[PDB]
Every structure is written in structure tokens, then in C-alpha cells.
Amino acid sequence: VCCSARYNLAILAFFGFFIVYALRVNLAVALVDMVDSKKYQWDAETQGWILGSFFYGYIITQIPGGYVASKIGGKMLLGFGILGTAVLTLFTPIAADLGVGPLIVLRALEGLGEGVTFPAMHAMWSSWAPPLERSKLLSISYAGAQLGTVISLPLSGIICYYMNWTYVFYFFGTIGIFWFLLWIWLVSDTPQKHKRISHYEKEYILSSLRNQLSSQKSVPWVPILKSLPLWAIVVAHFSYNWTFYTLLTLLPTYMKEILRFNVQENGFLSSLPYLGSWLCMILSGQAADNLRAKWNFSTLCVRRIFSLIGMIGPAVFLVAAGFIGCDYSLAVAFLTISTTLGGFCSSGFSINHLDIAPSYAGILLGITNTFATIPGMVGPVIAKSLTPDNTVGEWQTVFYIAAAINVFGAIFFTLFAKGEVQNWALND
């Protein structure tokens, strides 16, 4: 039944991430319409910092967000993070008028508010998803970001065409509040707290989670930081984020500067890879859960297979993108194929935090994001320093580096990953 309580939560989280990512993306396309050459005379560096200061706040509140979510539950953290994002987005037109400093402060506040949503959602699923249904539920929850980017890219441009650029922020921000009103009303942080959950569904979920939750009184920080299986996930996530920062920022820039294709202006062709990623995310979660449920594959084997696919497969196409030459059509094809194969990581390492320690998945995902958000802020300078002459060979070297990092991460995860609850997560 589609209207079951846990899938209702999954759909609501899907739309929450859709809204948050649409809010995040629409700035990148409203900016080009408001900058000069009233219009604001911000150069390339000022625009880059306006865009990138979000992550300097996004990084900070990952581990604290996970810890607080494990202590009190994720409902309020997620709801208020997304509400803060929306409300602060509503003020972007004013902050732009005060000046660069106020706007960078606003973006940093958005990042701080938004840092807790992912660890909070993991800590929320640690109480809602039965072990043999995590792949479906988490995939449905996190495909919202992909669909949000897909819908935000063209619709914001349409709004700017028919309305002033401020209405983009107004529209998405008010939709954020209208979603928060549903989140406050329809969702609870645990099945025992749910107001409408049927008796047998609660019994089913609690019975499924009965022997995986922890009896411990306090977080095992030392075991968490000492466990090799966690560092396997960290190494996988860092490599994945580096590879996809490359794929979705540098490769479009490669097409812009070397091939002169200007994909950023086309719009729809830019959203195509995200649509493919959304569809593959959902279907690879479905297939990954079926493999564990019906065919009786070991969880670790499924994680290994899907991580190897979703990491190594994109590497080959990313490397090929440097050899395609003047044909930008096949460059777009490789971008789309790589971003589509990227969906398997939604059932690969991206879920393994719950697998190795469900009771502390919030903290584990907080640590993993704290490590994996670094590439999104170190890549700009690396690319700037690796392509001084801006020729095909330098971009080929950049793609070689990205593919090498991706393959090393995939191999490390394959070697050192685990798919069963660690003993340090069960009892003192």
C-alpha cells in the first residue's frame, strides 16, 4: 500500500529535499541575471564566493546535527533546517541590496541551518526503516534532491523571463513554508510517537528493528573513530564527491571553454543528467532491496556491487570525455551517462552508515559529510592551478586525477567495507 506511514514519511522527505535543493540551485541562475556587465557589479571572484560560502557553513553543523538528532530525534532538526533555508532565501533580495558582506553572511547562515538535514534524516530512518527495506526508503527520500535540481533549473529561468528575479526566491521560499506546515503536522520522529500509524505496522517495524538498536547509554566516540569500516565509507564518500564535483562543475566548464558549447545557457540539456540520476537512484534502490530480500544476497555483497558500479563506471566515461575531441554532443552524452550511473551510490556506500551502526547513523553520516564536503571547496583552486594554459592536455590530466581518486576510493571501500552491525554499536 502506497499510503503506509513509512512511505508517507519517505515521500514527505523527498519533497523536503526537493524544495531545499531547488532553493539552493535557483541562486546559481538568478545570479547571472542580477550581476552587471539595478544590477550589481560583482566580478567572477565575488560571484564565486557568494556561491561557495554556503558550504563553509554547511560543513560545520554536520557532526553536531547528527549528535543532536540521535539525542532528540530528527523531525525538528530537519523541519527547522529546511524552514531556515526557505525563510533566509526570502531575504536574499534585501541582502543583495545591503552589499556583498550581508549576502555572504546570509548564505553562511543558510549553510549552518542546512547542515543538519542529512544526518537528521539518517537518524530519523534509523527508527523507521526495517533492515530489508532501507534501500527503497532511503533512495526514495534522497532522490528528491535530484528532482529538485531538475525542476529548479528551467523553471527559475522561466520565472526570470516572465517576472523579476526576486520572484524566484519568493516563490520557492513560500513553497518551503507551505511544505514545513505539512511536515510539522503529518510526521513524527519514531513510530511509537506517530498519531495515525496502524497497530500492526508499528509492530512490524519495531519487530524488524528489535535486535539492531543499541542498549548503550552514551555514544561510543572512540570506537567510532577507531573503526576501519567507517573510514571505508569516508574514503568512498570523499572520492564520490570529488568525482561528481568534477562531473557537474568542471566538465560543463570544459565544454564552455574548450568546446565553446555553452551548456549552462541551454538549460534543459543541463538538467538531463540530474533526471537520469533521479530515475537511476529510485530504480537501483528498488533492485538493490530486491536482491537482498528475494534472492538472498548478502548485504555486504550488494553494497560492494552497487558501489563498484556507481563509482568505477562513471570513471571510464569521465576519462573518455577528455578524448572526444570537438564533438560536444558525445561530451553531453558522456556527462549524462556518468551522472546516471552515479545513482547506484544511493544504494551503495551512501546507506552503509545504517548498515554498520543504525543507532548512530546520524553521527556517522555527520562525520562522512564533514569529510566529503571538502572537495566541493578544494576543487576550485586545484582546477585553477592545474590548467594554467587552458588546453586539452591539462583538462585530460584533471580528468585522470579525478578518475584515479574515484577508482582508489572504490577499491578501498570494496576491500574494507562491512554490512553487519558492529559489536561496538550494540552493547557497552
Author numbering: 34 to 70, 99 to 489
Question: What did the article's authors report about this structure?
Answer:
Sialin, a member of the solute carrier 17 (SLC17) transporter family, is unique in its ability to transport not only sialic acid using a pH-driven mechanism, but also transport mono and diacidic neurotransmitters, such as glutamate and N-acetylaspartylglutamate (NAAG), into synaptic vesicles via a membrane potential-driven mechanism. Sialin (SLC17A5) belongs to the solute carrier 17 (SLC17) transporter subfamily that includes nine related transmembrane major facility superfamily (MFS) transporters, all of which are dedicated to anion transport, including the vesicular glutamate transporters 1-3 (VGLUT1–3) and a vesicular nucleotide transporter (VNUT). Sialin adopts a classical MFS fold consisting of 12 transmembrane helices (TMs) with two pseudo-symmetric domains: N-domain (TMs 1-6) and C-domain (TMs 7-12). The Sialin structures in both the lumen-open and cytosol-open conformations reveal a solvent-accessible cavity, which forms the substrate translocation pathway, at the center of the interface between the N-domain and C-domain.
Moreover, we determined the cryo-EM structure of the SialinS61A in complex with Fab10B8 at 3.2-Å resolution. The structure of SialinS61A is in a lumen-open state. The interaction between Arg57 and Arg168 is disrupted, instead, Arg168 forms the salt bridge with Glu171, which is consistent with our observation on SialinR168K. These findings support our hypothesis of the hydrophilic interaction network in the luminal leaflet to modulate the conformational change of Sialin. Indeed, the S61A and R168K mutations confine Sialin in the lumen-open state, indicating the importance of these residues in regulating the conformation of Sialin. To functionally test these interactions, we mutated Ser61, Tyr306, Leu309 and Tyr335 to alanine individually. As a result, the sialic acid transport activity was considerably reduced, indicating that these residues play critical roles in the transport cycle. The lumen-open structure reveals that the hydrophilic interactions between Arg195 on TM5 and Gln273 on the cytosolic helix, Ser196 on TM5 and Arg353 on TM8, Lys197 on TM5 and Asp350 on TM8 seal the substrate translocation pathway from the cytosolic space.
